[PDB]
Design a protein around this ligand. Structure first.
Ligand SMILES: [Fe+3]
Ligand SMILES: [Fe+3]
Lengths: 114, 118
C-alpha cells in the first residue's frame, strides 16, 4: 500500500503548441496501476490545455479554484468540488482565467498512458 | 458509447448510508457510476466521526484521494493517519480499512475498476 502527499510528487512542466502553464503529477502510474492512472494537474494563471480528443474517457475532480472547461463548442466554468466525466472521443480542453492556481485530479484508463 | 461531458457539483449527489457487517458511520456518493463508466467508477465517501470501515480485502485495487480531514488508514500491520491532499493506492487483495478518530467528517474519493461494482 502506498500512502503519499500528492504535493511531494515532482510535477512535470508541460509547454507545447497545445499546452502552456500546466504542471502534471503522476500519482498512481503505469508502474503500480493494473487498470487506470491517477494524475494531478496544476494550471497556472492563464494556463491552457487546448481542445483535443482521445479514444478514452476522463474522470476529473476539481480540487482548487475555478476551472474553465472548453467544450466542442463553447466553454463552462466550474469550481472546486465539481466532478467531470468526459466521454471517449469528446472534444475538451481547459483554461485558467483566474489569478491563482487551479488544480484538478484526472484519471484515465491505462491505455492512455500516464 | 454515448458522447458529451457531465459536469456536476459532487455535493448535489445525496450521501447514502452504508451499513454492512464491516462498515458503520459511513456515507457514499456515486459520482461516476456503472450506468455511465466505460472502465472504472468514482465515489466520494464520507466517514462520520467515529466511523469505521473494518479491515477487509477484495480482488480489485483502490485508488483514493483524501479531500477533507484526517483519515486513519488500517493496514495488515498497524495503521497510519493521512490528511487532505494524500493519495492512497491499495493493491488487489491487500488488507485495508479506514477509521475517523476526529470530531468532523472525513471525505475521500475512491475509484475502483467497474467489475467491482459502485
Ligand atoms: Fe484530455
Ligand atoms: Fe476496500
Amino acid at each position: 500500500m502506498i500512502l503519499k502527499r500528492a504535493y511531494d510528487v515532482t510535477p512535470q512542466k508541460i509547454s507545447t503548441d497545445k499546452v502552456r502553464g500546466v504542471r502534471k503529477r503522476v500519482l498512481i502510474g503505469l508502474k503500480d496501476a493494473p487498470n487506470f492512472v491517477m494524475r494531478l494537474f496544476t494550471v497556472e494563471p492563464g494556463g491552457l490545455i487546448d481542445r483535443h480528443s482521445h479514444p478514452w474517457e476522463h474522470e476529473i475532480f476539481v480540487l482548487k479554484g475555478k476551472l474553465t472547461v472548453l467544450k466542442e463548442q463553447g466553454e463552462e466554468t466550474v469550481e472546486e468540488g465539481f466532478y467531470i466525466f468526459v466521454e471517449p472521443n469528446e472534444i475538451h480542453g481547459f483554461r485558467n482565467d483566474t489569478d491563482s492556481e487551479v488544480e484538478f485530479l484526472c484519471l484515465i484508463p491505462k491505455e492512455g498512458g500516464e
